[PDB]
């Protein structure tokens, strides 16, 4: 896992936890004042940036599944923003697990009747954007290394 | 019926087997403070091994007899000095020293 | 559920290579056309050729089994007891 | 023989090592069933759009066109931070600046990223490529499995030889396609002695002669029966396994041209075997199982194209060290080494005179260097 | 069972029965002539000799094999003093190597003499002769026994008939100790 | 890492295809490798060769001494006992002189008869092949080998003699060179210090073949110049790089 990207993700998750329960206004004000996304292009190499974004999305989704709705929505829409601001050529898809799809489906079924209008809208937009690529493990795994 | 309670053993090679001659004795060595308090118990009681074994619960009377024989065969002056000196029999303080020795061996095992 | 212990069915049930090897070890003299007719028309001529070229040699248009196939390394002459290498050299 | 009874979800067995047994065909079927698909078409958008968005939100769970407009106006690129990433309290920016300093110190411009550019090109080779024929279009939801094939039987105990090749395979396709696509240099290798006749063209290579090959996945032996010159080493394998009660249960045998990747019962992260040419064994590690996507290769005639390759160092001519060796000599007096290697011209000029007569006694064999495919 | 190749034991461990038996016989004759079996159990020495022969018949593939491993492979109860007998026999073999010219220059050890054990047994006669020229006793006796069986001071002092009654009095148990013993053993 | 999935290594059966491969002798990648030599390996080789030579020289003398001892123990005559003792002392003095001979002549000439397989399977535990040990001792370990580097005059003499020899066997070439070195080191230094053959100026067919290679087997921007040289003999890496990288 990436050392600094995980720390940045945890910091942003704490920032979203200290905000209101569920409201995009906090997302807007945070993006406006802090602008957590700073190291996206800069002056780096092709594969360096590619692996950076890949590990970022992978870990941000792996973290998505005990912490409350605040943390959950924060991670989900950090991923949403990182995908929608994808100026790179891969348009890297967010890595997902098999059962994670059914989990998010049950989550949407719950949102159908709840005070999560904006959240459901953002998740529907992310789904329509074809941004999810599902696998069996959130990472790559072998037996030799 | 034996519901997989025991496991088969791949021993007793039909070819042949040898002898051991040493089965159970497997004594345990003494220590400095233990030898000191043992000489004290000797000076306090005498040579009757029954009482020595009764007062030493954690050491066997056979081991006590072996130690006494070894001392008689190697260090005679120490046994002579022990018999010269005498101490009245104490019970409560002896039990306190036994508890102290238990704590000491516990600390040793911890080390 | 001699070297001719296996029957025709037990032979056909074996791979083409083993089939050709056994046929050569048994007969030691047989044309390619006869080998093809015995093995069957459903088997490829190139396959039969590749199988026979490894366990036989060409002699005046006919195919003769190699000497080592008949005389393994651990075998010996049944009449004189000489090693199999000398028998193979003599047959060659 | 039916598949092992197990749930489609890959429940974990060991921490971050591998999951339990499961089926592939039923897995893919349930995967396609739990979705809608119809998204691998790259037809998002190249006018009346407000009514379409209103109908979409009405059919969906939101049903709020004003909220949809507000959210899409908030989520835009005109409000996105090229510029030097500094003047802001950050954490990873320190590591970034340290890496940039190390680059300016040691790395020169943009190079030495050989494997990186290789991965980049091998991944771009499968971006939006269309098939030659319209009937070769990969249907939506096709299973794509990533497989690592470790051919070398030895490795550097020092480094563990972490990287190696990695390929992709389709579920609907047969395992014979993967068998034939495996780029094993042992197949190109050739036997026989050609010292007296060096100009003789090597014919009937090991690939054509030793057609014996088979797989082994969870006690299932898949033996190729496509060619009439294929033997059955699984016979001897089962004989050895059954000759003594070694704890190995009964194993099933099947054909390789009748079972596809879907009918297999595999474990992600578990090593399986692919044995051919008698002793040429390959460790198969099926790492990931993913569906087809419009960004990936949509041509079924080009799904086996290896996605990651390894840099195999070639054996150079031991004499001149300028050319790659092509012949191996044993028991050669003129050779400076016992297992010696020579190239064409060097071997010709060292082991033969101007006329071409064999000078000295030796044993020459065609040496196919490992780096023949690359 | 190192004669016939069985399923468990691979072929590398299988050796020649006649040659291994002859080697073990030579080794145990050397042990009997070097004062190794006298006073000690013979079977541990036999085990050590056969193990050394099995290792010398192929030192390459058997350099890492141990005594316990060999016992487990052969399905034989490992004797306890077998290790000590093996160490003593290896020391004797090292002495024979030092006696020999090429071996003493090679400067072998208890782990590299197994490959030359054969050369030792080839002419063990003169080697053992020279080794005895330059006896085998337990290690507890060869620790420089300067004072062998020290002469104890003869003390035949007898007096007239006794010494005194103070010793009788100090031997007799006092009433306090009698009552203490009675209370303790009540 | 392990590559023994199916057959762990306890009962691996030698199958028909395996024995057929062994018979055909297709040694490709695992049964022909080689590893660099080490200083302790050199020391072990020297010691083993010296010990083998000394043992082969002493075994006849040891057998003769045993025969003399048997004669002494079996012959009860006193007249012949003096001659027996004289012969025994003569053999003892011979052994003493053999052992006193310095450790410079007991190594043998460059080409002598020895038991390479025996020495290998006894000392090297089979790690080093008999032929490899033979070559290493014949052209890399003999004490008469000159250790000093070349002054480039040996290269001049070698090329001058080869220009008339024809570059066929280069054994008489090394003999005429006369530097107390092995033909291996000679040819190594020669082909390391000399210039490339420089087949011919760049040509259209060669350029188009290199272009086809760069189009069929190239990945990204890196170009396998070694793969290029493999199919194009008579070139050098640096010049080929600098030339093909431009125009």
Curated annotation (Swiss-Prot), chain A:
Residues 1-145 are annotated as: SNAPC3-binding. Disulfide bonds: none annotated. It is found in: Nucleus. Part of the SNAPc complex required for the transcription of both RNA polymerase II and III small-nuclear RNA genes. Binds to the proximal sequence element (PSE), a non-TATA-box basal promoter element common to these 2 types of genes. Recruits TBP and BRF2 to the U6 snRNA TATA box. Part of the SNAPc complex composed of 5 subunits: SNAPC1, SNAPC2, SNAPC3, SNAPC4 and SNAPC5. SNAPC1 interacts with SNAPC3, SNAPC4 and TBP. This is snRNA-activating protein complex subunit 1. It comes from Homo sapiens. The chain holds residues 3 to 148 of 368 of the full protein.
Swiss-Prot record, chain C:
It comes from the Eukaryota. It is found in: Nucleus. Component of the RNA polymerase III complex consisting of at least 17 subunits: a ten-subunit horseshoe-shaped catalytic core composed of POLR3A/RPC1, POLR3B/RPC2, POLR1C/RPAC1, POLR1D/RPAC2, POLR3K/RPC10, POLR2E/RPABC1, POLR2F/RPABC2, POLR2H/RPABC3, POLR2K/RPABC4 and POLR2L/RPABC5; the stalk composed of two subunits POLR3H/RPC8 and CRCP/RPC9, forming a structural mobile part that protrudes out of the core and functions primarily in transcription initiation; and additional subunits homologous to general transcription factors of the RNA polymerase II machinery, POLR3D/RPC4-POLR3E/RPC5 heterodimer and POLR3/CRPC3-POLR3F/RPC6-POLR3G/RPC7 heterotrimer. DNA-dependent RNA polymerase catalyzes the transcription of DNA into RNA using the four ribonucleoside triphosphates as substrates. Specific peripheric component of RNA polymerase III (Pol III) which synthesizes small non-coding RNAs including 5S rRNA, snRNAs, tRNAs and miRNAs from at least 500 distinct genomic loci. Assembles with POLR3D/RPC4 forming a subcomplex that binds the Pol III core. Enables recruitment of Pol III at transcription initiation site and drives transcription initiation from both type 2 and type 3 DNA promoters. It comes from Homo sapiens. The gene is POLR3E. The chain holds residues 254 to 354 of 708 of the full protein.
Curated annotation (Swiss-Prot), chain D:
It comes from the Eukaryota. GO terms for molecular function: bent DNA binding; DNA binding; RNA polymerase III general transcription initiation factor activity; RNA polymerase III type 3 promoter sequence-specific DNA binding. Keywords: DNA-binding, Nucleus, Transcription, Transcription regulation. Its main location: nucleus. It holds the Pfam family SNAPC3. InterPro entries: snRNA-activating_su3 (IPR022042). Belongs to the SNAPC3/SRD2 family. Part of the SNAPc complex composed of 5 subunits: SNAPC1, SNAPC2, SNAPC3, SNAPC4 and SNAPC5. SNAPC3 interacts with SNAPC1. It is found in: Nucleus. GO terms for cellular component: nuclear body; nucleolus; nucleoplasm; nucleus; snRNA-activating protein complex. The gene is SNAPC3. The lineage of its organism: Eukaryota, Metazoa, Chordata, Craniata, Vertebrata. One of its GO terms (biological process) is snRNA transcription by RNA polymerase III. This is snRNA-activating protein complex subunit 3. Part of the SNAPc complex required for the transcription of both RNA polymerase II and III small-nuclear RNA genes. Binds to the proximal sequence element (PSE), a non-TATA-box basal promoter element common to these 2 types of genes. Recruits TBP and BRF2 to the U6 snRNA TATA box. It comes from Homo sapiens.
From Swiss-Prot, chain E:
Changing residue 140 to A: Abolishes response to oxidative stress. Abolishes the decrease in the formation of a ternary complex with DNA and TBP in response to oxidative stress. It comes from the Eukaryota. In response to oxidative stress, Cys-140 is reversibly oxidized to cysteine sulfenic acid. Oxidation of Cys-140 impairs formation of a ternary complex with TBP and DNA and down-regulates expression of target genes in response to oxidative stress. Induction: Down-regulated by epigallocatechin gallate (EGCG) treatment. It is found in: Nucleus. Sequence repeats lie at residues 1-69. Residues 144-186 are annotated as: Required for interaction with TBP and formation of a ternary complex with DNA and TBP. The modification Cysteine sulfenic acid (-SOH) is found at residue 140. Residues 136-142 are annotated as: Required for the formation of a ternary complex with DNA and TBP. Belongs to the TFIIB family. General activator of RNA polymerase III transcription. Factor exclusively required for RNA polymerase III transcription of genes with promoter elements upstream of the initiation sites. Contributes to the regulation of gene expression; functions as activator in the absence of oxidative stress. Down-regulates expression of target genes in response to oxidative stress. Overexpression protects cells against apoptosis in response to oxidative stress. This is Transcription factor IIIB 50 kDa subunit. The chain holds residues 181 to 407 of 419 of the full protein.
């Amino acid at each position: 896992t990436p050392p600094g990207l995980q720390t940045d993700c945890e910091a942003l998750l704490s920032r979203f936890q200290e905000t209101d329960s569920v409201r995009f206004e906090d997302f807007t004000e945070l993006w406006r004042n802090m602008k957590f996304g700073t190291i996206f292009c800069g002056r780096m190499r092709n594969l360096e940036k590619n692996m950076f974004t890949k590990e970022a999305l992978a870990l941000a989704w792996r973290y998505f599944l005990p912490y409350t709705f605040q943390i959950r929505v924060g991670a989900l829409y950090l991923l949403y923003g990182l995908y929608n601001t994808q100026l790179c050529q891969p348009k890297q898809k967010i890595r997902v697990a098999l059962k994670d799809w059914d989990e998010v489906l049950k989550f949407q079924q719950d949102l159908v009747n709840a005070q999560h209008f904006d959240a459901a809208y953002i998740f529907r937009k992310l789904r329509l954007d074809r941004a999810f690529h599902f696998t069996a493990m959130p990472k790559l795994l072998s037996y030799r290394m | 019926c034996v519901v997989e309670e025991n496991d088969p053993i791949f021993e007793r090679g039909s070819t042949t087997t040898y002898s051991s001659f040493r089965k159970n004795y497997y004594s345990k060595p003494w220590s400095n403070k233990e030898t000191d308090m043992f000489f004290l118990a000797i000076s306090m009681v005498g040579t009757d091994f029954s009482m020595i074994g009764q007062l030493f619960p954690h050491r066997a009377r056979i081991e006590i007899k072996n130690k006494f024989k070894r001392e008689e065969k190697t260090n005679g002056w120490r046994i002579d000095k022990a018999f010269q000196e005498k101490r009245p029999f104490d019970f409560d303080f002896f039990a306190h020293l036994l508890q102290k020795v238990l704590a000491e061996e516990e600390k040793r095992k911890q080390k | 559920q001699p070297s001719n212990v296996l029957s025709m069915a037990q032979l056909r049930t074996l791979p083409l290579a083993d089939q050709i090897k056994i046929l050569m070890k048994n007969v030691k003299v047989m044309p390619f056309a006869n080998l093809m007719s015995l093995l069957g028309p459903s088997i490829d001529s190139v396959a039969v050729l590749r199988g026979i070229q490894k366990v036989a040699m060409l002699v005046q248009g006919n195919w003769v089994v190699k000497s080592d196939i008949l005389y393994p390394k651990d075998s010996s002459s049944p009449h004189s007891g000489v090693p199999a290498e000398v028998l193979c050299r003599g047959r060659d | 023989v039916s598949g092992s009874g197990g749930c489609n979800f890959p429940e974990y067995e060991l921490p971050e090592l591998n999951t339990r047994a499961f089926h592939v065909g039923a897995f893919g079927e349930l995967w396609r069933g739990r979705l809608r698909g119809a998204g691998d078409l790259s037809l998002r958008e190249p006018a009346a759009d407000s009514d379409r968005e209103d109908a979409a939100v009405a059919r969906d769970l939101d049903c709020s066109l004003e909220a949809a407009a507000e959210l899409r106006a908030v989520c835009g690129l005109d409000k996105l931070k090229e510029v030097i990433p500094e003047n802001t309290d950050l954490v990873t920016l320190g590591v970034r600046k340290r890496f940039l300093e190390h680059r300016e110190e040691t790395i020169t411009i943009d190079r030495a990223c050989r494997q990186e550019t290789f991965v980049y090109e091998m991944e771009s080779h499968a971006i939006g490529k269309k098939p030659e024929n319209s009937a070769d279009m990969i249907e939506e939801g096709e299973l794509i499995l990533s497989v690592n094939i470790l051919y070398p039987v030895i490795f550097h105990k020092h480094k563990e030889h972490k990287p190696y090749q990695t390929m992709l395979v389709l579920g609907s396709q047969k395992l014979t396609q993967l068998r034939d696509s495996i780029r094993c240099v042992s197949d190109l290798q050739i036997g026989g002695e050609f010292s007296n006749t060096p100009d003789q063209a090597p014919e009937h290579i090991s690939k054509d002669l030793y057609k014996s090959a088979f797989f082994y996945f969870e006690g299932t032996f898949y033996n190729d029966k496509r060619y009439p010159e294929c033997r059955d080493l699984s016979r001897t394998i089962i004989e050895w396994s059954e000759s003594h009660d070694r704890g190995y249960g009964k194993f099933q045998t099947a054909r390789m041209e009748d079972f596809t990747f879907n009918d297999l019962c595999i474990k992600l992260g578990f090593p399986y075997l692919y044995c051919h040419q008698g002793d040429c064994e390959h460790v198969i590690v099926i790492t990931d199982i993913r569906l087809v996507h419009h960004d990936d290769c949509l041509d079924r005639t080009l799904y086996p194209l290896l996605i990651k390759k390894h840099w195999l160092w070639t054996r150079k001519c031991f004499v001149c060290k300028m050319y790659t060796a092509r012949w191996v000599t044993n028991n050669d007096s003129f050779a400076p080494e016992d297992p010696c290697f020579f190239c064409d011209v060097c071997f010709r000029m060292l082991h033969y005179d101007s006329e071409g007569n064999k000078l000295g006694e030796f044993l020459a064999y065609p040496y196919v260097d490992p780096g023949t495919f690359n | 069972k190192l004669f016939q190749a069985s399923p468990s034991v691979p072929a590398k461990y299988v050796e020649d029965k006649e040659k291994m038996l002859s080697r073990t016989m030579q080794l145990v004759e050397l042990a009997n002539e070097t004062w190794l079996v006298t006073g000690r159990h013979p079977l541990p020495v036999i085990t050590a000799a056969t193990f050394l022969a099995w290792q010398s018949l192929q030192p390459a593939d058997r350099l890492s094999c141990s005594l316990a491993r060999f016992c487990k492979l052969a399905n034989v109860d490992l004797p306890y003093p077998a290790s000590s007998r093996l160490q003593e026999l290896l020391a004797v073999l090292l002495r024979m190597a030092e006696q020999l010219a090429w071996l003493r220059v090679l400067r072998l050890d208890k782990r590299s003499v197994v490959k030359h054990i054969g050369d030792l047994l080839q002419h063990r006669q003169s080697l053992v002769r020279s080794a005895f020229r330059d006896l085998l006793l337990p290690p507890c006796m060869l620790k420089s026994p300067k004072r062998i069986c020290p002469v104890p001071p003869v003390s035949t002092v007898t007096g007239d008939e006794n010494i005194s009654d103070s010793e009788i009095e100090q031997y007799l148990r006092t009433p306090q100790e009698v009552r203490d013993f009675q209370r303790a053993q009540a | 890492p392990y590559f023994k999935d199916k057959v762990t290594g306890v009962g691996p059966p030698a199958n028909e295809d395996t024995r057929e491969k062994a018979a055909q002798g297709i040694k490709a990648f695992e049964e022909l490798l080689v590893t660099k030599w080490k200083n302790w390996e050199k020391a072990l080789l020297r010691k083993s060769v010296v010990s083998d030579r000394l043992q082969r020289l002493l075994q006849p003398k040891l057998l003769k001494l045993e025969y003399l001892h048997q004669k002494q123990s079996k012959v009860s005559s006193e007249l012949e006992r003096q001659a027996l003792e004289k012969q025994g002392r003569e053999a003892e003095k011979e052994i003493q002189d053999i052992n006193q001979l310095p450790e410079e002549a007991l190594l043998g000439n460059r080409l002598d008869s020895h038991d390479w397989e025996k020495i290998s399977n006894i000392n090297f535990e089979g790690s080093r092949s008999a032929e490899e040990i033979r070559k290493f001792w014949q052209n890399s370990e003999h004490p008469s080998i000159n250790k000093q580097e070349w002054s480039r005059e040996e290269e001049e003499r070698l090329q001058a003699i080869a220009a008339a020899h024809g570059h066929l066997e280069w054994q008489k070439i090394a003999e005429e060179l006369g530097t107390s070195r092995s033909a291996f080191q000679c040819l190594q230094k020669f082909q390391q210090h000399n210039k490339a053959l420089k087949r011919k100026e760049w040509t259209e067919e060669e350029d188009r073949m290199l272009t086809q290679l760069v189009q069929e087997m190239r990945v990204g921007s890196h170009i396998p110049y070694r793969r290029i040289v493999y199919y194009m003999e008579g070139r050098d890496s640096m010049q080929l790089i600098y030339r093909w990288t431009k125009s």
